[PDB]
RNA sequence: GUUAAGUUAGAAAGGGCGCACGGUGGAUGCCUUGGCACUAGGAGCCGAUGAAGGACGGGACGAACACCGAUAUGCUUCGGG
């Protein structure tokens, strides 16, 4: 998904992207705490996706100078 | 029936010697995951762009070892497989 990450422009790669993933992780952890989640690999894959987005943004910023 | 006299003893409450069968306890034999002494090549410094060394944390489900820092049991890119 890294290529698709590059294709998006910078604001789109943070605004309404690293925010929806954050809120989804929040809801997922709430459901797990309550006691009804079933599928549990979602947490790990969401966290990995967030890290990917942050790293590509930082790479762009570093290359900009 | 009465005198007189001899006797292995022969019993064993328990004990000694020999034999048979067990229990505790880790010598001996066999075996290495760890060490000891060297040889031939390399490398002989790290740090304010924050060191050597640590504290606290990170997993779906506890404590500990190993691994990693709010991008936390991991992220990109180039090669091997």
């Amino acid at each position: 998904m890294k290529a698709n990450e590059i294709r998006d422009l910078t604001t789109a790669e943070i605004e309404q992207k690293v925010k929806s993933l954050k809120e989804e992780l929040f809801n997922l952890r709430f459901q797990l705490a309550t006691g009804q989640l079933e599928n549990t690999a979602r947490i790990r894959e969401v966290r990995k996706a967030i890290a990917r987005m942050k790293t590509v943004i930082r790479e762009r910023e570093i290359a900009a100078n």
Side-chain angles (χ1 to χ4, degrees), chain A residues 11-21 23 53:
Chain A
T11 59
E13 280 188 26
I14 186 167
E15 63 185 342
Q16 274 40 69
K17 183 68 180 295
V18 175
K19 299 296 183 181
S20 303
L21 268 39
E23 63 185 342
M53 292 177 72

Side-chain angles (χ1 to χ4, degrees), chain A residues 43-59:
Chain A
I43 306 162
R44 203 177 289 249
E45 58 198 33
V46 163
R47 291 194 324 163
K48 294 217 232 278
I50 293 178
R52 182 154 334 133
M53 292 177 72
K54 290 199 167 272
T55 206
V56 58
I57 290 199
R58 168 79 192 181
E59 139 188 317

Side-chain angles (χ1 to χ4, degrees), chain A residues 8 11 14 18 25-26 31-32 53 57 59 61 65:
Chain A
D8 292 340
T11 59
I14 186 167
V18 175
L25 185 59
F26 177 79
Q31 291 170 229
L32 196 153
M53 292 177 72
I57 290 199
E59 139 188 317
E61 178 278 278
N65 302 74

